[PDB]
């Protein structure tokens, strides 16, 4: 029984030796061809002509594919509002118009570049500001409201109002999007090898495209080199085009995107704009809050509606607000459709909440920790969406982080550094988070597994979840080993496939361990019950002897397992019903030093205390906390996507888009997991960990703001209670310009 | 060590074994691209879709690889990798009075968080210079210091301190069609010079 | 008309009789030689997924030098008489892992695993030049290597074991 | 509802277009290598050296593999008495010594030819008589005994004893053995595409040889181009070698055997030798029977024991015999190990039975139909192994076949032909059969299925059975469609694989329809039960509507089904308990003309009536009766394997081994399925059909024997009750030699001789 032990990721040794196989590492068939997407260079335009003359002169050119080649249907995407191949009009730079197929990827690259498209430009809508001005939205306003707003504000000592923007983020999974499609030649059957978190939609979108039943399409996923939400639906853009080429040619076909194509085409986190108004007492006690959210959804719905719902569920962070109104709108723009990115709308909404909370504290001239603490939910409290907080552990996390980070002592020393230094300043902030666990769409909270014991007693486990680095398969092996009471060496997970576990939800919402853990567990229980008589007959025997006896007595050693998360069903009409199963909680305290003269900064130290219940694997769970935190630090402090005015992405590679490096991480980086906090609601008292830590990254942003505040108090108009706008990400540009001095002027 | 010829679908590459071959080849093919590290040319061909049908690789030539410590400065062959320049300069800095290494120290500051080991082990000095990117981190140091450039063609030879005139316009430098950059003398700093 | 290109990969002689000047070492390793440990993560020299060690007799310095390079930008036509080492050249779970591979694996320095071979080759190169490096030399070796998954802390901590 | 409808084989259009993919049709990986087995040329010898020096010179040569290369275990076979690769000693001419790996199959072939082997011969045992003389057997004697033999033999008016031999048979599946093995390079993982009836054993044997857990090995089977039992275990001789080459090289590797390799290495039907004694009344009524059977098992056990058990279970054919003793011994010999072949020992023992029955009728001078009928079991009788015959339909099959074949009028015409012709004669025979349905090893009578309904309402069925042409998948879709009440166009079966249904029994014993039918049906009931609430909420909605509502309500649309045949377990110690679930029955009448001067013969007419309960698909079942009958016609008349005195197979291709051809089949060939005989014991009242009809091909053998008897009354002597031995197959040589006349005797030369 290894549950609770820091067992390393099962594949890590093979990952270190270069033996682990990712999609493009699969050998090529002798007749395998290569696909490359031909993409829009205009944000909004009619397609006038497509000329392939030059492409046809490229050695090894096979064909050009376009909407006219599709046998089944050109309508695709989650809400059936996308094309597989654009027909008359393109609606973003990156919009897929067609594909070349060639005998080598180099020849496909060369041929694609020489495909000539003629456009007639149409007027484009790129910014959130543009979309609002044109009422260019998907669907209607989303809203959560509680209490009496025109009572709260009537009562408030003060108000703060303003506007905040947070930029998007590219996923930058180290392995880009990849599909191999193998046409069988019989009955429209096709087998697909795909770097995707959603083998179900892949399968369904390929079949729809082809005009073929879903039972003809087999999708297999060994592992991804990262997904982070980005391979949850947008992987089909490559998969469907590759399936089409396989169908047309009758040959195997593959495509792996180059980084620049991937950044342009496949979408990122949603940029958010927020307009807010908070009313509060002289004490810093919040009495009213009104926030209007706007997301830049891009050129299709995709997951944008659910991402806004999640934002609205997290606009409270860990704070009790008696009177509250949040609204969301989804901006329809001529940009690549934006999608799931780790946090799924939560970090954006949580950041908006911490931004005004920080401005409340400044306005009242109180310590930031004091204002946060005094507004914090208490055990038993209801959220603005009327769900009770049971086992609310932020108070413990807060107390322990304050103590172990030595926050009050170091706050003193920050102040001393600031009084002793002119052109460098230190900041220090401590921030909480809560993150609700479940898909907010009730029907996705289902999970299947399938387990076989073979006659040598070795066990093959299959579940609907996929491995992208998060150690899900490791965790499922620890679960099965514990449940079957056999060592992990007897159990194997090979891959995720639609022919072993059908209709699976995407591997998403941080719930995979919870839901597949339960499926695996139930299947193991079924096995144990079937084996029990044989155990009784041969009590001093071995697992192997029991299995073989069951086999020879014609007892089935194969079973399914299923879990359906109970009691979920939030209603926007009644503002009731649980939206989440439980919440994951955490607190981070971060210190930075800024260079007032350059806008550069150094992350000095970070301490995190995270409630992950009783961890299934502390090493994986700490690894998840550190990974998420650093992705969040990149979102808020480093990573910036930049577009031309005509809506074309400039930042298309690691030289223009900076994700955190070895040297970006805090010099002192401490993560602890909260002790003695079992979670009754999930497998073996554990809690979801994948997404909840990312927002803690914001602690570095508010530490930066705190340091800018000190720099301004030194060189500009001195009002202690002076507020200024700092959007996310806080890049060197923004940090420097905000340090107003004799040089900026 | 002899001259090698490789021929592909769109490109002919000649690996020059001697300085004479290089200068002869550059005279015959004035437009040829000189590849060493390929960290610029490989990018222009992949991402700007440029085609350069004639490439000469001079990385083998002893004169483009020579590190020479003189009275006025340290001279590096144009093909010297940035990690070699770094190591030579780190060695000079630890050995010489601080007052002679102000420029070396500047070059070393620009080299610090300049890519990673992989790029710096193959990127040439001459490559960064002749590329002449508006955002080259080395050209401003070389210009400010008046780093001396030895430029060579078949027969002719010259040494010019780098000044503002060396970069007339976008991605252009003041070398004639038949010319190559041969070596780069980075000067010791003087008394009362910072 | 056209010369032979001769190099070595993981101790083995590679004789290319028809080298195309446009071919990168990454393409050659993956798609001609079938050595898929070395990964494509960007193609523009910024992520180090494609990191390999190159080795050659330096006529000038006299000795054999070892250094890291991005196979995605290395033209094979620059490699005449050079020796390439990839992740598969240093250890395997089928034979025996190199200590660099064991320690990154056991230290939880590999999550999705796609950056791991590149980082392995960066550390390995360092050790071929400096068998007893410092902590600072260790962080430095990785300025060219990106990881999206781990937040980097475990990788440095497992490799610190090699310092002093 | 298509059950009972003549639906074509679902892959038939694709087979006719050349679009159906068999194993070697799968595209090759860029790096894929080819293997060729290296095999013994001696029946029994010590291996003194293997020399690969000339093979190493072949362009594209990669490596030679032998026993030293194996990482796990060199011990293989069903009873672990085989080697993967022979080490110090070879024990038959096709015995696998090693393998060559090369870059093309032409280069593998070239290099294998030139591998030189040195041997030191050892004393070999080839024939059953060799093995009996030397006491060379596997295991001890098998036996079933009932009644009182001494008592029976005393009450008999007449006793006939004799000896009889039935030659073996090569499967001759049009597609030979074939495996592709794909090594993944992580964790010992391997994926194999194999022409095999037994994915479970393939997976186990590969795992065993590699020394890795079974969960690492995935085996997939789309379809076989014929199996007929020869792919039930012997497929692993090729699979395990290819897996090793894949393991060793790290490349994908394949092997498809040339016909000559396949016939030599992979084994065939067991030849049987029988020594018999029957006691009967002047009426033709049987009172005592004693048979000792001996099979030629070859150089390992394989399935030989079970094949002999099935032979003993069928030594009665359709006849009630009060006092009976049957024994069986397996002969251990230096020939390729013999295996399952359609019928699985049943046809050999049923042939022996019809032979002594034919002699009873001749001895009594009574018409053969009358003697058979008189001796036939009745409804509710027990067999020699004390199983009750419930729903015994042979009486019905017999009557309808007599009537529809116009047997009695045709009997007159054959007599008239024989009266008018000197050097040609006609013969006519009618014969019944019964065939027990179940594996006689109780634990194999288990089956799984796995069914998924996707959100578009399309259904994917997976079950433990493999398709080899018998239309198992076709039948499983017809079953699933009837069970789910949806059209067949909504259901699909892709292939059989060990990661969807584990621990599957081999596709064998004719029981697949029955057992996978039930597993599929049960999975379908499970799905129906889960959809029932949605159907109740929306009774006028569509299948698609109910499926989507169930998905949206988080009800699982995926399940297993399993079936375990009830009440099975025969004991040799008590001669008690059911060996079979039920029996399939049939009757065939066949008419032939022989050329007494050459031994050539013509099949004139055959009529068959078969009890297949309520057919799931009369077109497929009629196809099976016709196909099985023609294989039996081959077994008993055409097909003859022939070995050198040193034990080397001479007959290794269609030029020297003759399976039935278009021109071989009876000129008038009529088959009827018996009407209104539902079988309560199996899926939708159907019965197994695969193997039961093959013995009916013996009707041709016994028509030939009848014709020979006429030839002998004409030219050899006047003894109307003479019993001559005629072994199977009755080839031209055997037929001609049996028509003793002035030429066989040389009396025509002026010499004295043994004719009239
Ligand atoms: C990821 C990465 C990060 C980088 N970061 C930085 C950075 O921070 N700061 C910075 O300044 N640069 C940076 N660069 C650019 C790098 O410094 C230059 O790319 C490098 O010095 C070019 O050298 P090369 O040998 O690779 O040139 P090549 O690509 O081989 O050639 C470049 C150009 O120089 C010419 N050339 C080379 N030698 C001669 C010669 N001797 N005579 C005449 N012409 C010659 C060639 O014809 C060609 O036009 C970066 C590059 C990469 C890929
Ligand atoms: N190494 C790694 N960790 C990761 C990701 C990833 O792609 N790689 N994806 C994240 C996202 S977006 C989610 S929703 C969770 C999904 O996995 P889980 O449900 O198994 O925790 O893992 C997170 N952690
Ligand atoms: N076309 C075809 N029919 C065939 C065979 C075959 O290989 N091809 N094998 C036979 C044998 S040996 C058996 S045991 C049964 C097995 O299939 P079933 O169990 O589905 O009848 O099919 C019989 N009919
Ligand atoms: O990842 C997610 C996702 O895909 C969907 C979704 C919604 C509607 C659909 O029709 C669909 O296919 C998916 O909802 C979510 C809701 C969450 O709270 C969190 C998530 O991470 C997801
Ligand atoms: O095909 C058959 C077969 O495989 C076996 C068998 C026996 C022992 C084993 O260990 C094993 O794996 C299989 O028995 C049988 C018994 C029958 O009456 C009929 C058959 O057709 C088979
Ligand atoms: O829910 Mo993670 O895939 S954003
Ligand atoms: O039982 Mo059929 O495979 S001989
Ligand atoms: S692939 Fe990113 S550096 Fe080579
Ligand atoms: S482990 Fe995923 S990018 Fe490094």
Account of the 3D structure:
The structure is cut from a larger assembly and holds two copies of chain A, one copy of chain B (about 190 residues) and one copy of chain C (about 160 residues). Helix content of chain A is about 30%, strand content about 25%. Chain B has about 190 residues and is α+β, with helices and mostly antiparallel strands. Chain B has helices at about 20-30, 40-45, 80-95, 100-110, 115-120, 125-130, 140-145; strands spanning about 5, 10-15, 35, 55, 65-70, 75, 150, 155-160, 180-185. In chain B, the strands form two sheets. A five-stranded antiparallel sheet of chain B has the order 5-6-9-7-8. Chain C has two domains: about 1-85, Roll (Ubiquitin-like (UB roll)), CATH 3.10.20; about 90-165, DNA polymerase, domain 1 (Orthogonal Bundle), CATH 1.10.150.120. Chain C has a five-stranded mixed sheet, covered by helices on one side. In chain C, a hairpin with a 2-residue loop joins strand 1 (about 5-10) and strand 2 (about 10-15). One copy of the ligand Nc1nc2c(c(=O)[nH]1)N[C@H]1C(S)=C(S)[C@@H](COP(=O)(O)O)O[C@H]1N2 binds near residues 472, 507 and 691 of chain D.
Oligomer: part of a larger assembly
Main sheet of chain B, how many strands, which sense, barrel?
A: 5 strands, antiparallel
CATH class of the largest domain in chain C: Alpha Beta
Q: What's the number of extended β-strand segments of chain B? A: 9
CATH class category label of the largest domain in chain B: Alpha Beta
By CATH, the architecture of the largest domain in chain B is named 2-Layer Sandwich
How many domain regions of chain B? 2
According to CATH, the homologous superfamily of the largest domain in chain C is: Beta-grasp domain
Question: What is Rg of chain C?
Answer: 16 Å
CATH topology of the largest domain in chain C: Ubiquitin-like (UB roll)
Coarse structural class of chain C = alpha+beta
End-to-end separation of chain C? 54 Å
Number of strands of chain C: 5
What is the CATH topology descriptor of the largest domain in chain B? Uridine Diphospho-n-acetylenolpyruvylglucosamine Reductase, domain 3
Q: In sequence order, what are the helices and strands of chain B, one letter per element?
A: EEHEHEEEHHHHHEEE
SS strand fraction of chain C: 15-25%
